[PDB]
Design a protein around this ligand. Structure first.
Ligand SMILES: CC(C)(COP(=O)(O)OP(=O)(O)OC[C@H]1O[C@@H](n2cnc3c(N)ncnc32)[C@H](O)[C@@H]1OP(=O)(O)O)[C@@H](O)C(=O)NCCC(=O)NCCSC(=O)CCC(=O)O
Ligand SMILES: CC(C)(COP(=O)(O)OP(=O)(O)OC[C@H]1O[C@@H](n2cnc3c(N)ncnc32)[C@H](O)[C@@H]1OP(=O)(O)O)[C@@H](O)C(=O)NCCC(=O)NCCSC(=O)CCC(=O)O
Ligand SMILES: CC(C)(COP(=O)(O)OP(=O)(O)OC[C@H]1O[C@@H](n2cnc3c(N)ncnc32)[C@H](O)[C@@H]1OP(=O)(O)O)[C@@H](O)C(=O)NCCC(=O)NCCSC(=O)CCC(=O)O
Ligand SMILES: CC(C)(COP(=O)(O)OP(=O)(O)OC[C@H]1O[C@@H](n2cnc3c(N)ncnc32)[C@H](O)[C@@H]1OP(=O)(O)O)[C@@H](O)C(=O)NCCC(=O)NCCSC(=O)CCC(=O)O
Ligand SMILES: CC(C)(COP(=O)(O)OP(=O)(O)OC[C@H]1O[C@@H](n2cnc3c(N)ncnc32)[C@H](O)[C@@H]1OP(=O)(O)O)[C@@H](O)C(=O)NCCC(=O)NCCSC(=O)CCC(=O)O
Ligand SMILES: CC(C)(COP(=O)(O)OP(=O)(O)OC[C@H]1O[C@@H](n2cnc3c(N)ncnc32)[C@H](O)[C@@H]1OP(=O)(O)O)[C@@H](O)C(=O)NCCC(=O)NCCSC(=O)CCC(=O)O
Ligand SMILES: CC(C)(COP(=O)(O)OP(=O)(O)OC[C@H]1O[C@@H](n2cnc3c(N)ncnc32)[C@H](O)[C@@H]1OP(=O)(O)O)[C@@H](O)C(=O)NCCC(=O)NCCSC(=O)CCC(=O)O
Ligand SMILES: CC(C)(COP(=O)(O)OP(=O)(O)OC[C@H]1O[C@@H](n2cnc3c(N)ncnc32)[C@H](O)[C@@H]1OP(=O)(O)O)[C@@H](O)C(=O)NCCC(=O)NCCSC(=O)CCC(=O)O
Ligand SMILES: CC(C)(COP(=O)(O)OP(=O)(O)OC[C@H]1O[C@@H](n2cnc3c(N)ncnc32)[C@H](O)[C@@H]1OP(=O)(O)O)[C@@H](O)C(=O)NCCC(=O)NCCSC(=O)CCC(=O)O
Lengths: 160, 156, 161, 161, 161, 160, 161, 160, 161
């Protein structure tokens, strides 16, 4: 049984789900400090789309909506190792796109490292940034050596 | 700055401390599944004595008090790798003892793997179990070890 | 479509009808248990039932009573309807019940089995060796003279489902 | 010690277990009626059941649905448990239901009777002549095609109990 | 006209005078039990009394204290007034108490029986074999040293009344 | 005027100062016991103390812990102030303690007696023969190596 | 590790046990003060005590009574436990008490000192020259026959700690 | 049965007790106007320690607490004639002292006539007045020919 | 005994006197700004100050204005009292301010530094190279003629304290 929930720090079910998400993100991104991942996962202005399989967290996308700035930041995307290469990361991004169309945010921005660029390209992201710099600089962190990537959503098509 | 705090799930800082504790327990005891460490650490009946250095969790002792049965179960003990062999585990157990003196629970029970029995022996634990099996079977979740406390010694 | 639910009567209409269906399956599969005794336990607030649902319809379940102060759970009734037996449903039911009890920090099952049900419990890991002290269960679990008391110990490092 | 009570799921525990017992008696005495269908009707708030209680225990009953805007009542289930049959309980059940409906000013019963119970309904005054207009019940009562639609007219001037 | 009622001081006037009558019957039938001790227990909120009422008047009863956390009930006083004895009232009193305890899921009675009434308790199924662990009652029930501790196990599957 | 009162931490001003007076008498008469340990026990709500009052002031008492699930009571501290000893006061305190426990269906006392006072416990009916099973008292009573475990059996009584 | 706390009896076990510890230290260091009198004042709610805490344990304190309507504070008890004396703790206590009173705008201390205590108070700036008139303190502070009344004047423009 | 109550005008029991006190004071002090005694007994800022024997008033002490001035005025002391020379007047003053220690007023002042001086001396009063004149003058009435007397209380001793 | 507190005027007596002490320190260490202007900003509700408290006394601080809608904070005043300079306090202040803003999801500081302060800001990692576009800060912070705009970029993954 597979399930998708948008959760966040505002219930013990959600709390343990947020811990599972922090565990998956941290294990899959080990050269990122664990407490930084924890702080963002439990930050109230951050949300995570949780992928639940048999009541257990197997992946998710931590994101940050900036409705005032007209875009959403993709922070963390991860699926646990034994569940990768099965389409879960694509289904997660599709659900996230549908969610954002219904909230009328049609631009994704993310600073991608070299290991994630291929995944983002296959989700429709590109290095051609239409959103002006004055709208994102400082709101999202420009990590040196990371690649800024953008995805524009079409609100006339069904992603899920 | 070193500080000790008895915390648990009933505040963002305590919450992040509980996540940090769940991380340290999971990493140093890789054989217990992470989700089950998580549910034990966030269980209201469970408490954790947290060792905080400069606002960051570096170790702790997760424990379950059984005042009706006369003892406390030690669930997880861990100090993060780069802080071991510094006496932090001893200070942790000392504070746990002092805490339990103040609550008049005078027996610890725990299951120790062969890798850690020497630490527990240096904290006064023994494999001679004085609590009857009829008292702890089913309450404490390896080598069973017991520590008896003396409510006259100041442990800290 | 297969479903599993822990339900019970709380001091909702679907749960009520599911409990009536569970009382029905328990009664038909356990003809020596009086119908009203099954109904009284199934609708008792401190009893829970793990219901096994196929196409929105009860085809099996396990009724149980948790004793967290005593450190064990009592297995009250287990049944799968006849035309769904010998398909693994009773084992999946027990597996789910084990997972549920790990998540609630209860690692001991106690039950009484007659000669016809012992084999089922043995295959689910139950044994005639009872480690729980009698001072912990006598007077809290339903006693059955002439049946065999059986015990299952769970390992909370293990996923059963 | 015999008691009659009109009950339904609007319930305390006694009424809840009484409704379970009624669903059990109906289901056992009507074995080709699906148990889950009997359960939904017995626990439906728009349905009531006249319970026959002997020594605190259900031994029979009549499940029915009143249609006061239509001026009649639909008889749904009638059953007495096996070891209490042929003692007049079914007749006393129907008499109490008639008296109940006089005091609520519903003077027509409609029911479908099969080959096993049509003689019982005939002895309670039911007839195959349907005086209620067909347009008044065709969209309201369940049509049990194959069984015989029967009607009973009540006289609000005689005492039935 | 006989009635059974479980009452206690939690009382309207009828219950108050019923409790006085019970204290009178207990005290007269147990003449070496101090009247004031009987009164305090009969009027203690933690104690209940099953009253046997004949024509609006107390003719017997059983005072008892339930220990649900301990899983048993302590039988304190049993008495029937002199001119109603040897008629089965004491047996019907005990049967009603058993039925009451089944429905509250307490399945063990403990009592001290002296030389004048041990045969009555034996005929109600009490035995000198105490299955309840000594650690479970030694701090809760009054120890009437000189009398014999007896135990009765209840079967929640049979009807006692 | 002599008064006996079973008191404990819940209290009101009268009871509070009596508890302090009890902690004083216990501490002065048992000077190798840590003062704050006696204080923590006397003010622990699961412990009770039978106070012996003369002219509104504590001159003695018995601090005890009831274990009804186990069928006995642990006697923790017994003391009478120095200028009031050898007058029968300690016997009357133990007699009242027995009466109180007979009414509450506790028929066993357990206590650890040292060499300075074991004779006093013997005269109150205590003996070294422990009939309470070892499985009932371990972990509940504070165990002391170097002192002698003593037991007293009470006779039950029907009141009035 | 050293801490200073102003406490008093107004639910808090830690404060309660600290007050007991302060009462013990005052009593042991002032053997001619009756223990119950020390207790009655230490637990009096118009009295406060500045507690000197080392490693969670009371090792000294100053019990005092603020008279804001009269413009002074009465020093009631001062003590440091024997094994911690002659280390500066008594001086640090009084300095903290002075700083506490500067921030509450009470600039006079009064106390009665016996011959053995006069030296300590003189080293804390107290004098036998009393500027507060007798009509301001007599009958408010407790007087002591034969002890020496001492006064300390505080400067609110000076940091004491 | 003997009883002590501190009562005053703020219940019919207390009212009739205040009438009995007014009767005893007036009968024992007959050259004082009856309405003056009545006015003071029923004045809300005045209190009377009532001595009750078998439900009937047999004596009392009408007093006036001046906590702002740090003393209490003794206004009327009387015991009915057939109950005098039995220690009741002493027990009344002892209870009044204990009451005032618990309220932290440790000085009594009274203007005594020649017939009462002996009683006050045996209760520890003297003509040596420590309380400065500026603290009592005008608050208590200096009747010509009356003797001002003072008693200082020791809060470390039990008076009852 | 050093403490750090983020405070501002929305009330508390402790906070109010601290804000006065901060206005005093800023004004004395920056004597050529009008002290009325410093007071207005320090007590403005949109402004916060990170206060450095030593032994209960204000010895320094950083007054700042968070602009979360613009994604940066303006550094308004920084000062440490003269007797406490060149001890690392200014560095610890800025470190605590960096950690505070990381936890509030603000990653840029901007400040207009006079010539005497440039060296201090450079040591705290500030730069003259301004990455924030002019449209984001012009008009929210005041561009004093002759002052040097400097920027500090923060890293959410770095522990600053
Ligand atoms: C990247 C994900 C989330 C992808 O999950 P899934 O495996 O479920 O993806 P999928 O839906 O099954 O489809 C994968 C398809 O993309 C293609 N592809 C190319 N590069 C890929 C890459 N690194 N990972 C996964 N797929 C990749 C595959 O060939 C495959 O081709 P088809 O089209 O034929 O199916 C996972 O692999 C993972 O958790 N990796 C470790 C953590 C991680 O790197 N997260 C992203 C960085 S998140 C972060 O904040 C780090 C900093 C940063 O992003 O820079
Ligand atoms: C074991 C601890 C908690 C001990 O903490 P520390 O390293 O800070 O110890 P310390 O206070 O600095 O030093 C105490 C003394 O113990 C002695 N000693 C002997 N064997 C030791 C051993 N395996 N580990 C640590 N110390 C040991 C050392 O000589 C040491 O110095 P001296 O000789 O000078 O005195 C830690 O090292 C750790 O986290 N290890 C990995 C996790 C772990 O093993 N946990 C235990 C099981 S957890 C549990 O309670 C049950 C869980 C389960 O197993 O199911
Ligand atoms: C027992 C169950 C619940 C099991 O249902 P299922 O048929 O779905 O089980 P399954 O997973 O498909 O098969 C499990 C395996 O156990 C082995 N086996 C041996 N003896 C068995 C026995 N009596 N019952 C079921 N399985 C048994 C089978 O060979 C089977 O295959 P493999 O060997 O190849 O693996 C059912 O048969 C049933 O409803 N029976 C009637 C009701 C009943 O007896 N309930 C239990 C007592 S009621 C209770 O809980 C106690 C209360 C009391 O009585 O006091
Ligand atoms: C029919 C009842 C409810 C009747 O109960 P009792 O036996 O107590 O009736 P009684 O008062 O004792 O007897 C009254 C008279 O009915 C007569 N009689 C004729 N045919 C009968 C028949 N099939 N069943 C019972 N009685 C019958 C008896 O001989 C008797 O005649 P004398 O007085 O002259 O001596 C019972 O037999 C029963 O539970 N049967 C099984 C369940 C059932 O069939 N229910 C009705 C199906 S209809 C239904 O509810 C389902 C809905 C649907 O199918 O549409
Ligand atoms: C004991 C009772 C309550 C029983 O009342 P009943 O006479 O109505 O009993 P019953 O149902 O009519 O009779 C059932 C069977 O018990 C049998 N039997 C044997 N010994 C008996 C005995 N001493 N008293 C009464 N019945 C006795 C009868 O022969 C009969 O046998 P068959 O069926 O085979 O023909 C009564 O006798 C009574 O009130 N006695 C005086 C009060 C008393 O002793 N109460 C119990 C003391 S114990 C108590 O409550 C005090 C607490 C304490 O002391 O610890
Ligand atoms: C022990 C007590 C409480 C006893 O009080 P009293 O002096 O008032 O006793 P009493 O009623 O007047 O005398 C009763 C009889 O006890 C006898 N006897 C024998 N040894 C005695 C002993 N050490 N102290 C007092 N009495 C003693 C007397 O001779 C007398 O014999 P006759 O029949 O001929 O008249 C007191 O002496 C005391 O406060 N001692 C110091 C504190 C202490 O030691 N407590 C017990 C610690 S024992 C321990 O290890 C912890 C357990 C605990 O403290 O509860
Ligand atoms: C008096 C204190 C509280 C002082 O404590 P400390 O020893 O910590 O003081 P200190 O700061 O370490 O020493 C300060 C210096 O004062 C000098 N000095 C003078 N008299 C001293 C005295 N009695 N005790 C200790 N030091 C004293 C010493 O030379 C010392 O060194 P240098 O000069 O070289 O620097 C303590 O000694 C104590 O607890 N004594 C017993 C209780 C007591 O006496 N309480 C006071 C009366 S109680 C009260 O308040 C009045 C109530 C009443 O009696 O009516
Ligand atoms: C004065 C009292 C209240 C005392 O009452 P009691 O008789 O109960 O006193 P007591 O407790 O029994 O003890 C009396 C002891 O004091 C000694 N003594 C010396 N002179 C005494 C005197 N006038 N009255 C009573 N006792 C007196 C006695 O010898 C005796 O000696 P021992 O030590 O050996 O036992 C009573 O006598 C009384 O009511 N008198 C009339 C009213 C009165 O005068 N009240 C006081 C004035 S009140 C007022 O406002 C009037 C104005 C004014 O006071 O000036
Ligand atoms: C500037 C501060 C706040 C710095 O406080 P501290 O002395 O505690 O700093 P520190 O951490 O101890 O020392 C850090 C190092 O900065 C280095 N350094 C280089 N140039 C410096 C400069 N102009 N001012 C201060 N430090 C400077 C020093 O070498 C020093 O040693 P190392 O490098 O060897 O370690 C203080 O000195 C002060 O209050 N000055 C007066 C007011 C002021 O000028 N504030 C500056 C912001 S001016 C303002 O408030 C508004 C106007 C504006 O924005 O300019």
């Amino acid at each position: 049984i597979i399930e998708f929930h948008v959760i966040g720090n505002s219930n013990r079910r959600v709390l343990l789900w947020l811990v599972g998400l922090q565990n998956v993100f941290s294990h899959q991104l080990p050269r990122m400090p664990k407490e930084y991942i924890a702080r963002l996962v439990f930050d109230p202005k951050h949300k995570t789309l949780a992928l639940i399989k048999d009541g257990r967290v197997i992946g998710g996308i931590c994101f940050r909506m900036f409705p005032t700035q007209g875009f959403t930041e993709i922070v963390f995307c991860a699926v646990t190792s034994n569940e990768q290469v099965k389409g879960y990361g694509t289904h997660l991004m599709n659900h996230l796109k549908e969610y954002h169309i219904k909230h009328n945010i049609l631009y994704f921005l993310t600073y991608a490292d070299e290991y994630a660029i291929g995944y983002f390209k296959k989700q429709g992201f590109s290095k051609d940034i239409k959103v002006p710099k004055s709208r994102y600089l400082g709101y999202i962190k420009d990590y040196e050596g990371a690649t800024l990537m953008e995805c524009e959503l079409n609100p006339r098509i069904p992603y899920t």
